[PDB]
Amino acid sequence: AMIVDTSVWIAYLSTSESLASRWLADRIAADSTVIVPEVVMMELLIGKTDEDTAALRRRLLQRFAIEPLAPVRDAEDAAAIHRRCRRGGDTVRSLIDCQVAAMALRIGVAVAHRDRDYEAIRTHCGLRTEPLF
Amino acid sequence: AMIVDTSVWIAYLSTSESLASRWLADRIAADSTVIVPEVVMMELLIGKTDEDTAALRRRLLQRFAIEPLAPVRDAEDAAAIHRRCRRGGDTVRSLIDCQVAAMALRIGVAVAHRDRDYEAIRTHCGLRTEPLF
């Protein structure tokens, strides 16, 4: 039961040789639970403009658990996370990363990722991560 | 009843004078209806790391209608908007803009903004805008 960040899904879709891609392929093969935040779904759905490819990726993510953000609260927490990290000297590059982290902290799961933004959030907020560089 | 994008709120909060800033000041002074998407609220709350400033700005936005996104649907539409614009030759620079547009089109309001991204969305999807450059 963990959150798989956009960065890993992108790695999975981009090559078949990276650690991140291989890791996700293994997780998919084992029928393990993948939590898909709706904001991660959103980022993934813009990677190809063809509507049939988009529809196919939509069905890919539907295999897993698509989780909606907690209205207002996740967004407030995301901004709180960004401010805390910045006070700590780290400017997180995406508010979407912070929403994902806010959700993870809320439901108590780790985030699998290939994005140093999450290690920044780990440093200042404690977020559990599985880095896959 | 209209959505005010982050870009206009930033103009207002910034120390620089500008038409956008004067426009929002006027609208605030008139008690006109301002719609605040949660993602706009999120963006605005990271502009200053100071927690007391954040809290005060949280109360600023609370004066108006904080509008929640529609779970899953707004995110899907945001991505569809981004794909449609990209097929039309415009790469929208923020998925948050797309979420704001998705909400605007769903509830049927215009977006006041100082961000060409919404003019691209207007071209391809018909989004009503009030540009404030």
């Binding site: 956009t6 960065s7 992108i10 790695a11 999975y12 879709l13 981009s14 090559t15 078949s16 891609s21 996700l24 392929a25 998919i28 093969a29 029928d31 980022e43 813009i46 990677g47 190809k48 403009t49 490819t53 529809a55 196919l56 990726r57 939509r58 069905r59 890919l60 539907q62 295999r63 590059r93 995406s94 979407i96 990363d97 290939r114 994005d115 | 790469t91 929208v92 620079r93 923020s94």
Partner: peptide, 29 residues
């Protein structure tokens, strides 16, 4: 419209099927 969720083999078949942006690009267009 959301089609039927992919089966396991179907999902695995999408590995390497392509993405127009790096993660860096998707976070800063």
């Amino acid at each position: 419209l959301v089609g039927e969720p992919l089966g396991r083999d179907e999902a695995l078949a999408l590995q390497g099927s392509g993405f127009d942006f790096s993660n860096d690009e998707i976070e800063s267009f």
